[model samples]
Target: MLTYGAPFNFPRWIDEHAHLLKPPVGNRQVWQDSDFIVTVVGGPNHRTDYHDDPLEEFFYQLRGNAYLNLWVDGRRERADLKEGDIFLLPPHVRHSPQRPEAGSACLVIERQRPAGMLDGFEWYCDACGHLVHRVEVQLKSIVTDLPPLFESFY
Candidate 1:
């Protein structure tokens, strides 16, 4: 089961800084509590800021397309996502989403639990092929069990 909401409703907020928050890259605020958070993602991009969450997360592409980059078990993998596609992010795994020139939109489900300053976790940029300084924590671990990725892509 999942939920949804709009977090960019602050008057004049989206208009002034819409460009900074590009589709697939820009994440609109959504409902968040101590348990989890729900957000609407507008397109494909990457999170240069790599950090880990104590909780897990589920991402569903409500519209558009995207690619999820994951670093699990010391291995890096990629998953192409489209509308209706869903995936899970485990706790403490390094991961980021990417969207090509066409861009995409998605729903990002996050767990809500302070993992302490983001600097506490490791950071890396797979695209740039460089390491980065850690910052404040931004993600939480997910508790939900998600479906497996279809073997067609393999």
Candidate 2:
């Protein structure tokens, strides 16, 4: 263990850093390298692609609502994020989150990936909702791994 866990100032983090955040760029990594990750996302997300995590993610809504558009078992499901709301996002469940227009933020927690496991991202053909392409990510860092995958989907 890290020997000690400490509290964070979510609002201060948002206030200081919100100006630098945008879609896919807001996942500020607060902590990592311990087989787990904790972070915050602020502002709106521009791209829309479904990604399935290699590990479960705990999402806590800290500001305006965000909607997780999900697909599982060949069906569609929706998870809404409102202030104080939280959800345990299961691994391998395809989902796309729609962040609100402003002052929207979420604290997301996830575990480090196991060897040989990769995250999946897919962009479907809007007409029939089928895979256009899928990317398997080793996820060296969220900073580097995600943006390009969404770019490739187009």
Candidate 3:
């Protein structure tokens, strides 16, 4: 019953599935194409690492509130995304998205990685602002690929 490279239907109601994005299931892939991936993500996530992505990411806050913690010019900044708010993140910026409340969710759209491109996750010292740890991977699937990365890092 699966369509090989397309969604079964269009006009997906992303909010209807917000309850499904909790704890161990933080993200649900709504659709995947040759060049992009769309997902609905629910919050209270366990992440303190900054992501280094090669492609820009689009975010639309569906419910509750969210924060995008960013590393810019060697310092940290925050961008608040309230319900119904949308944002576009630039490429190669190290960012950590913070969703502090349960049931808070967002719709994220990202360009699928091109051949040989890698994504990086990094941790920096809070006090000294020095890089403490970093890892890079050629991400294939966000749902299946990230759990292990989270496990190894945390």
Candidate 4:
């Protein structure tokens, strides 16, 4: 676990964890303090479900570029990000960050969820734009918690 109130060298940290920066292991939580959850995500990822988070999520494009796909007003929309760009997504937006480039990476920070605040995952019908299925979870570890959900969804 990364200690609080210490200097975090991004490049060095990424370099050290470079071997583990592949699909199914892309999201590495760098810090999980009382207030925030910080992660360094490397891709190309395989995330299809839209995350319905109750708090705002902050993103900083660390390398390459990606698109944050969103479902808004019953339509699909995208917010693009390039290297060095930062995007702050509002609370409760159903979004999927698409990292299609192999070397792409980003820093994501989210407010830690309090007790009873469940994070939701939803899949939408492609042809009809209807909600197909949904699950709300008390997310504890993205690595340990999410993969099982993804497997069950598939």
Cα-based TM-score, every candidate: 0.58, 0.85, 0.86, 0.91
lDDT tens readout by residue for model 1, 86-105: 98877766766676533345
TM-score of candidate 1 on Cα atoms, chains taken together: 0.58
Across 21-140, the per-residue lDDT of candidate 4 in tens digits comes to: 776577677765557888888888857899999999999999998888899998899889889999899999999888887877799898778888899999988888899999999987
| Candidate structures ordered by TM-score, highest first | 4, 3, 2, 1
lDDT of all predictions, in order shown? 0.56, 0.77, 0.82, 0.84
Model 2, position 44, has a per-residue lDDT of: 76
Deviating ranges (above 4 Å) for candidate 3: 1-12
Tens digit per residue, CA lDDT, model 2, 1-154: 5443577676896778777656546557776565668777776774467888878889999887888888877766778888889999888888898876577778888877876989888777768867777778887677667666656545
Clash pairs for candidate 3 = none
Ranked by TM-score, the better of candidates 3 and 4 is 4
Model 4 stretches astray by more than 4 angstroms: 1-5, 32-34
What number of clashing residue pairs does each candidate have, in the order they appear?
Answer: 18, 0, 0, 0
lDDT of 1: 0.56
RMSD of 3: 3.0
**Global Cα lDDT for candidate 3:** 0.82
Q: RMSDs, each prediction?
A: 10.9, 2.5, 3.0, 2.1
